[PDB]
Amino acid sequence: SLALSLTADQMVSALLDAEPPILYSEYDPTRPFSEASMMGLLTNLADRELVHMINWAKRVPGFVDLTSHDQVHLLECAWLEILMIGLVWRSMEHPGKLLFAPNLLLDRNQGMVEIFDMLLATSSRFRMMNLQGEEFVCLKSIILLNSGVYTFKSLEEKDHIHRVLDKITDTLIHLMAKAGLTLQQQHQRLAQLLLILSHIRHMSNKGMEHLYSMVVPSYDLLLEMLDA
Amino acid sequence: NSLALSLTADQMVSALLDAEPPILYSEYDPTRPFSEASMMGLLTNLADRELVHMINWAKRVPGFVDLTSHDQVHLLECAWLEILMIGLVWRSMEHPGKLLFAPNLLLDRNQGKCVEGMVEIFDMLLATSSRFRMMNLQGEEFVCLKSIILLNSGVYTFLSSTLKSLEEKDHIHRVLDKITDTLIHLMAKAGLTLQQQHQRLAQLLLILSHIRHMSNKGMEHLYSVVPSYDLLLEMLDAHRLHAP
Ligand SMILES: O=S(=O)([C@@H]1C[C@@H]2O[C@H]1C(c1ccc(O)cc1)=C2c1ccc(O)cc1)N(CC(F)(F)F)c1ccc(O)cc1
Ligand SMILES: O=S(=O)([C@@H]1C[C@@H]2O[C@H]1C(c1ccc(O)cc1)=C2c1ccc(O)cc1)N(CC(F)(F)F)c1ccc(O)cc1
Numbered sequence A: 001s002l003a004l005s006l007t008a009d010q011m012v013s014a015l016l017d018a019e020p021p022i023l024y025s026e027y028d029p030t031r032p033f034s035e036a037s038m039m040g041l042l043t044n045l046a047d048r049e050l051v052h053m054i055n056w057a058k059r060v061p062g063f064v065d066l067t068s069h070d071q072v073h074l075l076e077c078a079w080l081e082i083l084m085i086g087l088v089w090r091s092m093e094h095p096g097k098l099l100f101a102p103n104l105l106l107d108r109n110q111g112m113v114e115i116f117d118m119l120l121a122t123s124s125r126f127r128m129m130n131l132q133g134e135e136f137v138c139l140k141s142i143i144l145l146n147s148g149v150y151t152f153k154s155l156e157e158k159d160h161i162h163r164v165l166d167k168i169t170d171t172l173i174h175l176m177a178k179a180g181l182t183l184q185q186q187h188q189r190l191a192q193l194l195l196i197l198s199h200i201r202h203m204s205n206k207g208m209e210h211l212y213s214m215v216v217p218s219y220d221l222l223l224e225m226l227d228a
Numbered sequence B: 001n002s003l004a005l006s007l008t009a010d011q012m013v014s015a016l017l018d019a020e021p022p023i024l025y026s027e028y029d030p031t032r033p034f035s036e037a038s039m040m041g042l043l044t045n046l047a048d049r050e051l052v053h054m055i056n057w058a059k060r061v062p063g064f065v066d067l068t069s070h071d072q073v074h075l076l077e078c079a080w081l082e083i084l085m086i087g088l089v090w091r092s093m094e095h096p097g098k099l100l101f102a103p104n105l106l107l108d109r110n111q112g113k114c115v116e117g118m119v120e121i122f123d124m125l126l127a128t129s130s131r132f133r134m135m136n137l138q139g140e141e142f143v144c145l146k147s148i149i150l151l152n153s154g155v156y157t158f159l160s161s162t163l164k165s166l167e168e169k170d171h172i173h174r175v176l177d178k179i180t181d182t183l184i185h186l187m188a189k190a191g192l193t194l195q196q197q198h199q200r201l202a203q204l205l206l207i208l209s210h211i212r213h214m215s216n217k218g219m220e221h222l223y224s225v226v227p228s229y230d231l232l233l234e235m236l237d238a239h240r241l242h243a244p
Helices: A008-018 A038-059 A066-089 A113-129 A133-145 A152-180 A182-211 A219-227 B011-017 B036-057 B070-091 B109-114 B118-135 B138-151 B163-190 B194-223 B229-237
Strands: A098-099 A103-106 B099-100 B103-106
Touching: A008 A038, A008 A133, A008 A152, A038 A066, A038 A098, A038 A103, A038 A152, A038 A219, A066 A113, A066 A133, A066 A152, A066 A182, A066 A219, A098 A113, A113 A182, A133 A152, A133 A182, A133 B194, A152 A182, A152 B194, A182 B138, A182 B163, A182 B194, B011 B138, B011 B163, B036 B070, B036 B099, B036 B109, B036 B229, B070 B099, B070 B118, B070 B138, B070 B194, B070 B229, B099 B118, B103 B109, B109 B118, B118 B194, B138 B163, B138 B194, B163 B194
Parallel strands: none
Antiparallel strands: A098 A103, B099 B103
């Protein structure tokens, strides 16, 4: 695959170009706040974000080398983690608030609040680490390829995914070396970034558990969206 | 404030190997075949006995006893099932297609069906054991990973705004950095290239996301027996018991 031939710079350029835009909520600012429903707005936003995520996934180097079945399985496993890391990234520069959209910026009180606090904690960790956009797009691609890989031609698929994950590792280390980090700082920061992925997994599972208590894209919906 | 951050990679590995808990046995001669009740009964009895030894292990993980009793319990509340699960996956590595719960309790996929919906988690644990076998995970790496689960799982859910809480969080991140250095040291000693070292570090830590997922699924299925704050605090304190 041409994906395994990419330099760190080509991988970063690919991922930056594939980035979805930041979407707005359908919140009409000329209309009062009590017209707007919070779960209503977020569902509508997530549904629009999912179309963008599908087209983003297809542009992640190596992803379209997989079978349609394997693509859907990785998306089924990663979609809420991908939504959540996007939210945390957008919220970084707004301490104590979650920027769901530029027109839906919420503080803790207006949140449910269990997950809010976990997302705020992740945003604070990214701010403390000074997470860079080039690092963020690498981490979001790792979530896509890693989340579903341990729950799968299948041997060849898994091998291909692990080789693309290794290329993303090389890319993260290259970015850190370019930024002037020592070898020791490079490995410490690589580990700090990847350990936050365990917290995003945890938040996604809690989020799934809360969704059921209070929308989830099916295998078939994701397959149809990939084929479209 | 402590000597934990002063350890070398070699001293850290020695500390973690020495702290390793014992392998326990399941109840001898349980009635087979299992019901859902009797299978859950056996596994609960094993996990409850393992939890005592995990607390003693936790106290010997460098830096853990530098935290407040409250922060120690918080990390254990968040990590205990992940710690039990990575232990099970480690024990099961040399038994493809089976989970070695205990030396006297070796179960294949079909026996997981006795408790709906526990075959799902069985398959995920078997997949993790296969991944560890594929990576040739070493004992020195396994003890590092188990310590990372203990320190990492609960660290992002201390939300407090005291100077002490900031200092606690900073201390945990510094111990986690020393364990990272220790993993890299082990790989460099084994003769891996810098590129191979970073790739293997990332492969090991990404499997921790899968263990978190299994732990959450496990909890979600249990709800559809969890050690209390008070039980964990009593076990940490290890106060002398009044005679029966
Ligand atoms: O986990 S939550 O359920 C959920 C997951 C996350 O938050 C909600 C959400 C969602 C997703 C799909 C969908 O169809 C409806 C919502 C997210 C989301 C994330 C990023 C993104 O770009 C778009 C959507 N949550 C907690 C919280 F703390 F407030 F976040 C919540 C939120 C509001 C609310 O009234 C009740 C709960
Ligand atoms: O396995 S379980 O998921 C469970 C969760 C996980 O494993 C068990 C658990 C635990 C939980 C509480 C406790 O007091 C004793 C053990 C953990 C564990 C993990 C690793 C380890 O080395 C030691 C203990 N299971 C039955 C099934 F068929 F096996 F699935 C079940 C358990 C509890 C429950 O409330 C409902 C269902």
